[PDB]
């Protein structure tokens, strides 16, 4: 399971 991979602002 992955960490927070959402793109940064």
């Amino acid at each position, epitope marked *: 399971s*992955a*960490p*927070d*991979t959402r*793109p*940064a*602002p």
Partner: antibody
Amino acid sequence: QVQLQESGGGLVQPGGSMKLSCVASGFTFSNYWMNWVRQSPEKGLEWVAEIRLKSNNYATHYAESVKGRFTISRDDSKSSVYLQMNNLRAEDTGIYYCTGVGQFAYWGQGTTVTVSS
Amino acid sequence: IVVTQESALTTSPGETVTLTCRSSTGAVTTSNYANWVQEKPDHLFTGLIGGTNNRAPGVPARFSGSLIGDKAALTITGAQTEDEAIYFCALWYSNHWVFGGGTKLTVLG
């Protein structure tokens, strides 16, 4: 401009309890997970806790050394993340930072927590 | 789990340096989502790389993350004097992170 700003650090005796606060600004705090990471002389950087998004039910994970004594939580209404520390030990002494975004791009200035009898 | 980095490295400005980061459990892979964090004098921390090779926003193009052999690595191409600082790497193990000891970087200024 993004800014993370911790708060609530202080001196405490073993057995003590305190709550740290971190307020984020300059970006959509609600969109990212937040973590607490502490810096101590004897230990360098040590990850302490993470908290995910509202849509993750505010799910959390903790380092084994902190499990059962620390609790991370967030309030997106306030753009803030927090760390409630209980049953503090001298080994918990250190500078505590909230940090997040891909996966530690942002770090606050840190708040010192000293646990000493 | 123990994450190991080089204690210190020295470089003249304009040269390239690579710092590595190993895991005591085995090879570092993309699943460890290796991060690289920079500490400048006064406890100023800033993330450089996340997810192995994704450079954080605003971070200079001269910084690159990668995987070399069984380790994660940070490469600074054409290092500048402003890069003298300490560099930490952090590795993800399914549901927790372990940070390395930090590498002090000197860029002879």
